[PDB]
Amino acid sequence: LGSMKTVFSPLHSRRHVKTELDGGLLIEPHEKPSRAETILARVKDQALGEILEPEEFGLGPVKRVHTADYVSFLETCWDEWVAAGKRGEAIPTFWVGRGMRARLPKDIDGRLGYYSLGADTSISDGTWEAARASANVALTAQKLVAEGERAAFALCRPPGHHAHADVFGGYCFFNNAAIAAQAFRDQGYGKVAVLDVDFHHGNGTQAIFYDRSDVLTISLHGDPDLVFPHFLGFEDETGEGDGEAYNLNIVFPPDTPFSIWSQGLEKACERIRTFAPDALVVALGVDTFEEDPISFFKLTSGDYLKLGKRLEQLGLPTVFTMEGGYDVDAIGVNAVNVMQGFEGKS
Amino acid sequence: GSMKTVFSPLHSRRHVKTELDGGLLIEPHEKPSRAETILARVKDQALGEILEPEEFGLGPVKRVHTADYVSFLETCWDEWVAAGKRGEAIPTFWVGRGMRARLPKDIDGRLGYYSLGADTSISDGTWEAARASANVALTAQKLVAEGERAAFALCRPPGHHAHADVFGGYCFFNNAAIAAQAFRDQGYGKVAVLDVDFHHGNGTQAIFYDRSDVLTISLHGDPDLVFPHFLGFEDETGEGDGEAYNLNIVFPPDTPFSIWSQGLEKACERIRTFAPDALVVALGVDTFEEDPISFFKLTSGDYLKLGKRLEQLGLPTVFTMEGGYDVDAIGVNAVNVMQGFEGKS
Ligand SMILES: CN(C)c1ccc(C(=O)NCCCCCCC(=O)NO)cc1
Ligand SMILES: CN(C)c1ccc(C(=O)NCCCCCCC(=O)NO)cc1
Ligand SMILES: [K+]
Ligand SMILES: [K+]
Ligand SMILES: [K+]
Ligand SMILES: [K+]
Ligand SMILES: [Mg+2]
Ligand SMILES: [Mg+2]
Ligand SMILES: [Mg+2]
Ligand SMILES: [Zn+2]
Ligand SMILES: [Zn+2]
Numbered sequence: 006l007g008s009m010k011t012v013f014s015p016l017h018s019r020r021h022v023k024t025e026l027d028g029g030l031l032i033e034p035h036e037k038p039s040r041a042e043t044i045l046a047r048v049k050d051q052a053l054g055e056i057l058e059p060e061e062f063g064l065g066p067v068k069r070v071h072t073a074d075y076v077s078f079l080e081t082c083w084d085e086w087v088a089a090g091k092r093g094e095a096i097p098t099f100w101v102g103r104g105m106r107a108r109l110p111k112d113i114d115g116r117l118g119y120y121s122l123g124a125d126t127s128i129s130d131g132t133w134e135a136a137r138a139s140a141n142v143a144l145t146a147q148k149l150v151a152e153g154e155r156a157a158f159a160l161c162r163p164p165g166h167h168a169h170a171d172v173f174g175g176y177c178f179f180n181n182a183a184i185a186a187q188a189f190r191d192q193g194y195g196k197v198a199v200l201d202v203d204f205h206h207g208n209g210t211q212a213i214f215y216d217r218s219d220v221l222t223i224s225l226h227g228d229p230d231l232v233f234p235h236f237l238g239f240e241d242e243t244g245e246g247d248g249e250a251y252n253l254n255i256v257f258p259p260d261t262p263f264s265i266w267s268q269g270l271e272k273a274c275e276r277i278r279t280f281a282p283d284a285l286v287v288a289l290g291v292d293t294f295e296e297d298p299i300s301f302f303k304l305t306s307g308d309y310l311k312l313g314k315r316l317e318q319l320g321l322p323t324v325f326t327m328e329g330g331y332d333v334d335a336i337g338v339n340a341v342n343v344m345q346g347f348e349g350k351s
Numbered sequence: 352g353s354m355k356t357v358f359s360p361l362h363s364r365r366h367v368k369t370e371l372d373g374g375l376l377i378e379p380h381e382k383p384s385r386a387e388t389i390l391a392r393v394k395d396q397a398l399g400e401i402l403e404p405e406e407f408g409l410g411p412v413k414r415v416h417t418a419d420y421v422s423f424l425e426t427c428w429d430e431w432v433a434a435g436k437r438g439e440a441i442p443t444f445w446v447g448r449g450m451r452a453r454l455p456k457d458i459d460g461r462l463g464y465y466s467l468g469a470d471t472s473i474s475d476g477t478w479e480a481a482r483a484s485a486n487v488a489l490t491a492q493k494l495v496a497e498g499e500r501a502a503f504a505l506c507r508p509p510g511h512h513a514h515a516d517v518f519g520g521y522c523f524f525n526n527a528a529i530a531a532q533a534f535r536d537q538g539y540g541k542v543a544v545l546d547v548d549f550h551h552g553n554g555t556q557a558i559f560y561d562r563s564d565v566l567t568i569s570l571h572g573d574p575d576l577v578f579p580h581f582l583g584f585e586d587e588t589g590e591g592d593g594e595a596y597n598l599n600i601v602f603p604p605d606t607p608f609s610i611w612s613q614g615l616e617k618a619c620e621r622i623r624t625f626a627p628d629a630l631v632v633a634l635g636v637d638t639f640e641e642d643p644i645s646f647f648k649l650t651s652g653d654y655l656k657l658g659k660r661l662e663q664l665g666l667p668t669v670f671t672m673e674g675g676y677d678v679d680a681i682g683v684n685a686v687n688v689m690q691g692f693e694g695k696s
Contacts, residue, residue: 029438093374102467105581115580122447235460
């Protein structure tokens with residue numbers, strides 16, 4: 006039936022790190038260029054709709070969400086790391102432990118730790134440019150929807166939803182979904198909802214809008230007691246200040262299938278309807294998949310068609326930002342199934 | 352002069368193969384030959400009697416460290432292996448700025464909650480070695496409490512970066528803090544802990560930060576530039592009843608003994624004003640001009656001068672071994688402090 010436009014960057018390997026700290030070893034990263042290659046190949050093979058490259062928006066709309074100091078650090082981090090004589094990729098070794106001061110130091114190792122929440126997200130040559138391109142992909146999709154499209158697929162790589170205003174991690178650097186939501190707001194959309202269906206909690210998006218009532222943030226995810234990001238995402242985090250009751254976390258345990266997960270989806274859609282937003286950003290991960298190598302939900306490829314159909318029933322202008330999903334064999338089928346389901350495929 | 356040394360062969364149970372350094376997993380800097388080389392110099396110089404530690408149990412450890420943290424260190428490795436991880440136990444995630452200081456269930460979450468860095472791998476035997484190292488410090492404290500002027504606790508792993516419930520910087524139990532608290536528990540009214548290791552003793556500072564009965568002083572490289580980065584600045588003077596009972600003295604790269612010893616003199620005057628009943632010296636020789644991870648310029652002969660100055664404080668004194676990573680000179684440097692204390696120049 007319907008068609009949906011996809012925005013992508015041709016340089017899938019602009020970010021091309023070779024190490025990820027995992028179980029005490031430095032392994033090949035889970036978040037690989039072939040993730041974007043495979044999704045794009047399936048977008049073309051299914052003729053989802055027009056494919057386009059991103060427009061350059063510059064750092065202005067990125068800085069509506071992220072701090073100036075953080076954006077500067079990501080641009081210079083690799084250069085400074087190399088200049089200090091380190092021989093691996095840029096990985097934090099030390100951080101602000103409990104009892105220490107949240108105080109920005111001068112040394113590159115100190116800044117790396119100050120600005121991170123994990124050691125599994127290496128930085129190297131090209132990472133800065135890749136983060137910038139991924140944010141432009143998100144902003145191009147947002148522009149397409151603002152200028153008339155019902156929906157658009159921002160094929161973001163690297164993902165974004167773990168990044169705070171000034172913290173990177175969980176393979177994320179710029180919070181593409183938050184940048185898209187803030188762009189809707191800046192363009193006069195009074196209220197925006199960001200719905201996070203990636204397997205992991207969107208802690209970055211929660212933190213960015215936590216004290217605000219004009220952006221509703223909702224995430225379904227695996228229990229942070231058991232999985233990343235561990236220290237946010239619990240159901241008692243409902244917002245702060247004016248943002249009280251405008252954040253909603255819905256947690257699930259291991260082996261949760263679509264029959265159960267979709268009940269949380271319905272609760273999220275009901276909260277969205279009450280909020281009555283003017284635009285919707287969906288932070289889409291397919292790491293809820295039953296074969297995902299780092300996650301523990303049990304969705305099947307066919308369930309993603311049902312997910313897309315239910316999201317379309319919200320009846321809102323919708324930007325999809327690509328987040329996680331690490332079984333590369335199925336990542337294209339799974340992600341494009343959501344878009345096809347949104348466009349009417351059953 | 353003579354000084355007794357306490358040493359445990361169980362330190363060898365701490366023998367990890369990997370350290371995250373500059374984005375790579377390398378052979379660790381804090382390796383067993385450090386302790387063995389110091390011990391051989393103790394024997395070579397006939398410094399004094401060499402004793403093995405008594406077992407004091409977890410009680411004196413738990414006077415400073417939380418029960419949950421002590422329990423975590425005992426089970427960490429087994430939980431890591433049972434969860435299917437194939438490397439040594441290394442934190443990957445932690446409580447980032449903006450997140451909740453909330454203890455999770457999963458082993459990765461607990462590892463991150465209890466840590467300040469990823470350069471301190473845990474493997475089999477780390478628990479046993481950390482326990483033996485605390486007993487080494489407590490045996491040295493007992494020797495001094497029962498009549499010795501001073502004693503050398505040849506601790507490995509070191510301790511001064513360990514908070515009540517945080518490990519890191521190669522440290523698990525804060526041996527110096529445990530010895531200090533033992534003095535206090537035995538009726539010594541006031542105790543000073545003087546940290547001459549190159550790095551800030553952030554764990555010792557944190558443990559006593561709100562207390563005026565234990566004065567904590569550290570000389571160290573500028574944390575703006577070096578580990579631990581997020582504590583050790585001169586404006587950290589204590590909290591609550593502890594305000595004015597913590598003193599950090601910071602130095603820049605290439606600082607020689609002629610400058611470092613001015614900071615030492617300031618520390619000694621602060622101790623003299625405090626008038627403690629006992630002194631614990633957290634001793635690192637990573638202030639040495641050839642230390643591979645530090646940037647001060649002390650010579651081996653300067654350690655004789657350091658030990659002489661410490662003896663002039665006239666206090667019952669426990670030395671706990673902390674850092675120092677030029678293994679060629681680590682024995683000469685550390686034993687020079689003890690020999691300078693006992694009167695050698
Ligand atoms: C069994 N195994 C090999 C693993 C299990 C869990 C992780 C992990 O959570 N890593 C931290 C990154 C989680 C978030 C990734 C980015 C994402 O999709 N966010 O939604 C890794 C490996
Ligand atoms: C040039 N190079 C090879 C290095 C430079 C610095 C470190 C480091 O600070 N690592 C963090 C550990 C610092 C504390 C070590 C334990 C200690 O001595 N505490 O006093 C490592 C390597
Ligand atoms: K989620
Ligand atoms: K909110
Ligand atoms: K020190
Ligand atoms: K104090
Ligand atoms: Mg450094
Ligand atoms: Mg398969
Ligand atoms: Mg885990
Ligand atoms: Zn995810
Ligand atoms: Zn040191």
